């Protein structure tokens, strides 16, 4: 939880961030495995869901 020990903040409790496709609400890592889904999603479920997704591999180590 957010009060655990270090300081921080945003609270999550989701493994999964449900990203909606066309209107509806599914699983991100479903989004990110059916094209067809993607491709479904409005300009603003798009540029969310790939905005989600870009926050994701904006930091590698590798």
Known sequence: ???????DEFE????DPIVMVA?????????SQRPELV???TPEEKEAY???GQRMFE???E
């Open 1 to 7: 939880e957010e009060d655990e020990e270090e300081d």
């Open 12 to 15: 999550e409790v989701a493994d």
């Open 23 to 31: 209107g509806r609400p599914f699983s991100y890592s479903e989004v």
């Open 39 to 41: 491709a479904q999603m």
């Open 50 to 52: 790939i905005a989600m």
């Open 59 to 61: 930091d590698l180590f």
